[model samples]
Target: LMESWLIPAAPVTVVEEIKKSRFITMLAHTDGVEAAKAFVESVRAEHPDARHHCVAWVAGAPDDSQQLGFSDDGEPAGTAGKPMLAQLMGSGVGEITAVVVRYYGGILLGTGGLVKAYGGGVNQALRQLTTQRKTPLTEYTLQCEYHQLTGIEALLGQCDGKIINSDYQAFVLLRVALPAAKVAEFSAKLADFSRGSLQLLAIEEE
Candidate 1:
């Protein structure tokens, strides 16, 4: 089970020029290894003409052993990807993927400079990166009459909950997600608010 962890709020791109080489670093959110791979592929496709697409990612919790991976792509081994991953591992953020697409300049930057360029690009982007916390929450399906919708929405907001989906074919149905620990309390409040008429059917954690 997971509680809360910081994650990138949106995709960010930063470009740097080293010895005429264009290093485009993109920081984005990813849920797992598959997502990370997909992001890397997308970036590569977006810049197909670029020389290399070095990549690094923390697919899940940063501290989890199996959640870390990196690839040099074509740059000297351990020069590009390793240092990039080193910068992100202990960032206190998880589920992140960083891709550095390099458009090589006419000059060759030695391994030392390559490390500095790749790692420094990620570091600079991270300094300007915006992030948000993802908390463990449970989703519940709520059924009520049209008249009860407003009160239910209010109660959900009071409990720091969000309405994810809704339907109104037969009766108004609201699907909401709220902090996991607040389920029991929200249920009690709902019972009182509806005079013990509404039923909160928990769906699952989101």
Candidate 2:
């Protein structure tokens, strides 16, 4: 079974003061690159006095056909953007975006320090964000006589099959969130478990 996992939902600010400048970090799940870019702009507006705003984002599901996308923004090429992206990718998550903004505290953080600050900033944000495993909603149609309805319902309950609706006039229709791959096995087992008295009218995928 596949479940969604993400950082908790909380506004956290981590500022690393080196020399005389500061690096502010904000990490979040921004659906796609457009959303990610918008957030960077929004934060820039909020912290108008900040210096450089560097960002990285990983969009789409882990198992999705298209997996990752990222940007370096204004930092040196391959240094700021890629490192921040590495942090998100290495963290084992997708469909999330991270933005790191620098509010020149006045000291110079060399290329290596920039990478450390940018990458570390995102990690700080992740520590405060919320994560969840979203169960994919799906449905299935099961047909059975009134005599077999009660028994089938009982078995389905035990098997984690949720019945969205039923028709007493003839057959029973059930909607469930079973793992996508388990629909077939569930149908076959239901037949044998119910002594073949139950017939699967149709199996639908959502």
Candidate 3:
């Protein structure tokens, strides 16, 4: 019943030099696993000469832990990846990826310093990040006879749903979407209107 988090409006970069090691943080809005991995690989391609590329990302909402990911690369397993993800989740931003490109300066910052450099870089980058609000959506498909169009159209507005696609044949296939939280109530009302003859089936969106 409660959701709507911000995604990065644009990419962000913050560079910090700690003990001669350059922790250049890059942040990008990534909506899917492919895009998230693409962002990571893109950074690697850009700066392959760098010592390590520590990564952290949330491919979905902040609370959607299923998609959370992190990789420390070779810079002490827990030091880089853990703190980097810690900062991203703490920021309340969703569907974003962060990478710290480290260019070693011949000095070892050790585990504790590694955490600060990598994690702090992300925190600094987020502070400069602009965000776009994301509203979760739920899609529904319902087929009804032509005679029901008028009543269905009226109910659509009442439920704050929008028709996105339609098919016409022996029956009308109406594809609509609404804020996820409104789906249950709206679906029940639509079924009631059709006397249980018309039911909304939740669509599995790609």
Candidate 4:
């Protein structure tokens, strides 16, 4: 069973000064690896002169080992990316990317200090992050007769589902998405509407 997860409501940026180095922490909503990469680049563009732009992202679930990623982006490896990833995971927020940009101030922060600062930047920014609860969506495509379209649509609404896309042919093809938890409920009622005539179920390409 999937539960709702917290996601960034909007982008947040927080800055800190340690010794002389300026640490800029950015929190942005990024739902996939590609989006996370793009977000990192956008921050890189915003701080072209910063010596480092360490990035960590939880693009899926907070604990998703496969969907999350981190890059030190030139900071000493262990000091930036790992700690930033840990901080973001600890925050229990998903679909987010945290980037810490460092504009070195002359004074050298030891490795340990750099680790602390990098992760700490995100920790500080988390306070400023507004979040929204996101229920995981299940996508489905159903083939239904034109006569049954209206009834199917009405039933979809009852399940808090929406038709995202559609095609018209001999049969109406509908791409529907709704809370993952509600799929079973939706399908049962759909089957009741048909012994098999009203709808055919298939999970199509996302």
The residue-level lDDT of candidate 2 at 165 comes to 72
Residues 1-206 of candidate 3 have per-residue lDDT tens digits of: 23777899999988888887788999999997888898788889999889899999887666564588899898888999989898988988889999999999998966788888988989999999999888877677888899999888888878787888999988999998887777778778888888888878877765
What's the true lDDT of residue 111 in model 3?
Answer: 78
lDDT of 4 by residue, 1-206 (tens): 24678899999999999998899999989888888888777888988999998888887565654487788878887889888888788988888988999998999978999988988898999989999988877778888888888888898999999998989998788888887778888888888888745554658453
What TM-score fits each model? 0.69, 0.60, 0.74, 0.78
Q: Which pairs, if any, clash in model 4? A: none
Query: CA lDDT of 43 in candidate 1?
Result: 91
What TM-score does prediction 3 earn?
0.74
- Candidate 3, residue 65: Cα displacement in angstroms equals 4.4
Q: Which tens-of-lDDT digit does each residue in 1-206 have in candidate 1? A: 36677889999899998998899999999988898998888899899989999999886554553598899987899999889998887577888889999998899978899999888888888987899987756778989999888888898988889999999877988888998888888899999998999999977663
Clashing pairs counted in every model: 0, 13, 0, 0
> lDDT, candidate 4, residue 62?
54
Would you list the C-alpha lDDT of every candidate in the order shown?
A: 0.86, 0.67, 0.86, 0.84
**RMSD values, in order shown:** 5.1, 6.7, 5.1, 3.6
Cα distance off (Å), candidate 2, residue 129: 3.0
Q: Give the TM-score of candidate 4.
A: 0.78
